Scaffold this motif. Structure first.
Motif, short mmCIF file in Angstrom:
data_model
loop_
_atom_site.label_atom_id
_atom_site.label_comp_id
_atom_site.label_asym_id
_atom_site.label_seq_id
_atom_site.Cartn_x
_atom_site.Cartn_y
_atom_site.Cartn_z
N UNK A 79 -7.75 1.88 7.19
CA UNK A 79 -6.48 2.86 7.70
C UNK A 79 -6.06 4.16 7.17
N UNK A 80 -6.39 4.23 5.77
CA UNK A 80 -5.99 5.39 4.97
C UNK A 80 -4.28 5.61 4.87
N UNK A 81 -4.12 7.10 4.80
CA UNK A 81 -2.65 7.04 4.54
C UNK A 81 -1.72 7.52 5.60
N UNK A 82 -2.36 8.04 6.77
CA UNK A 82 -1.69 8.33 7.92
C UNK A 82 -2.14 7.17 8.78
N UNK A 83 -1.70 6.23 8.91
CA UNK A 83 -2.12 4.98 10.05
C UNK A 83 -1.05 4.73 10.96
N UNK A 84 -1.56 4.62 12.07
CA UNK A 84 -0.43 3.83 13.24
C UNK A 84 -0.63 2.44 13.12
N UNK A 85 0.43 1.54 13.71
CA UNK A 85 0.40 0.16 13.44
C UNK A 85 -0.60 -0.70 14.08
N UNK A 86 -1.37 -0.10 14.92
CA UNK A 86 -2.41 -0.93 15.57
C UNK A 86 -3.72 -1.12 14.72
N UNK A 87 -3.79 -0.39 13.37
CA UNK A 87 -4.68 -0.46 12.48
C UNK A 87 -4.39 -1.39 11.53
N UNK A 88 -5.20 -2.83 11.41
CA UNK A 88 -4.90 -3.73 10.74
C UNK A 88 -3.53 -4.57 10.91
N UNK A 89 -3.11 -4.39 12.25
CA UNK A 89 -2.07 -5.33 12.95
C UNK A 89 -2.44 -6.71 12.84
N UNK A 98 0.92 -1.17 -0.10
CA UNK A 98 -0.03 -0.07 -0.04
C UNK A 98 0.75 1.31 -0.07
N UNK A 99 1.73 1.22 0.64
CA UNK A 99 2.86 2.34 1.15
C UNK A 99 3.61 2.67 -0.55
N UNK A 100 4.12 1.55 -1.00
CA UNK A 100 4.57 1.29 -2.29
C UNK A 100 3.57 2.02 -3.58
N UNK A 101 2.45 1.55 -3.31
CA UNK A 101 1.06 2.05 -4.30
C UNK A 101 0.83 3.45 -4.29
N UNK A 102 0.88 4.11 -2.85
CA UNK A 102 0.80 5.55 -2.80
C UNK A 102 1.81 6.09 -3.25
N UNK A 103 3.11 5.64 -2.93
CA UNK A 103 4.39 6.34 -3.49
C UNK A 103 4.35 6.45 -5.03
#
Length: 289
Positions: free
Chosen positions: A279-289, A196-201
């Motif tokens: 989770x969206x673009x600014x997510x902390x690790x607790x989201x979908x851990x 996801x991070x890759x895709x957003x980049x």
């Protein structure tokens, strides 16, 4: 098959993993497996060495036609795929072999691609999945000079910036390769997060004025399919608050054989889109851990 509201995606996925009547097995098995259109040009004797896997070759109606350099030099195992409200936004292609590296670069030049998305490692186990078609420093392929001017390594991917020069042409172009390295040797990623991070980049880096994004893995079907479907669905979700994954895969498979090669990959597409929507673009690790 109707689109799914993004708020309903989490229940939709659970049901598809749960239902005895109709779930992911039934849905995935309904896609058209195998050849759905002519591939006469891809099959001719002169193009034999240009296809990495003989079963995953480019359909006539959707293929990237190269201007000749040899009448048979119009062929590359590559097909145009539409993006979200973006006609021919991607090129789905195989990982180049030694004998098609030059055609690969010719295609990048012709199509004015700004981004290459590579969703394979070069070697997996001891099997060469893709030729190393780029230099660490500088290299020449026919009349092309490729120079690596930056490498930016992240945890699950590397961004490589090149200049591309062609002998006899005054313009020096930039091409950025987004190389996802966090796809496992076997399976689908345990977490969608890196992809996801890759895709957003890539979304942030590709100019709207640039040519088609060149997407490849090894065969140009499975992991390539996953990337494209997720990318399109995240655009649809943002704009419409809806995703239509099933019809998206169907659309890709009209353009190129067997896009999204396994049911596991089809399910992973769902899990990845859901994490993205939750989770969206600014997510902390607790989201979908």
């Amino acid at each position: 098959m109707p689109a799914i509201r993004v708020a309903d995606l989490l229940q939709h996925i659970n049901l598809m993993k749960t239902s005895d009547s109709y779930g992911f097995k039934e849905e995935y098995e309904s896609f058209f497996e195998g050849q759905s259109a002519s591939w006469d040009v891809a099959k001719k004797d002169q193009n034999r060495a240009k296809n990495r896997y003989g079963n995953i070759i480019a359909y006539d109606h959707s293929r990237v036609i190269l201007q000749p350099v040899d009448p048979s030099s119009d062929y590359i195992n590559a097909n145009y795929i539409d993006g979200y409200q973006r006609p021919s936004h991607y090129i789905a292609t195989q990982g180049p072999v030694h004998e098609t590296v030059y055609d690969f670069w010719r295609m990048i030049w012709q199509e004015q691609s700004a981004c290459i998305v590579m969703v394979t490692n070069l070697v997996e186990v001891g099997r060469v999945k893709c030729y190393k078609y780029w230099p660490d420093d500088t290299e020449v392929y026919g009349d092309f000079k490729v120079t690596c001017v930056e490498m930016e390594p992240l945890a699950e991917y590397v961004v490589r910036t090149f200049t591309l020069e062609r002998r006899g042409y005054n313009e020096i172009r930039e091409v950025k390769q987004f190389h996802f390295t966090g796809w496992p040797d076997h399976g689908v990623p345990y977490h969608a997060t890196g992809l996801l991070s890759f895709i957003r980049r890539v979304k942030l880096s590709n100019p709207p004025s640039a040519g088609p994004i060149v997407v490849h893995c090894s065969a140009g079907a499975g992991r390539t399919g996953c990337y494209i479907v997720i990318d399109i669905m995240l655009d649809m979700a943002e704009r419409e608050g809806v995703v239509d994954i099933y019809n998206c895969v169907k659309a890709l498979r009209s353009r190129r054989i067997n896009m999204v090669q396994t049911e596991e990959q089809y399910i992973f597409i769902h899990d990845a889109i859901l994490e993205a929507c939750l989770c969206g673009e600014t997510a902390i690790p607790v989201c979908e851990f």
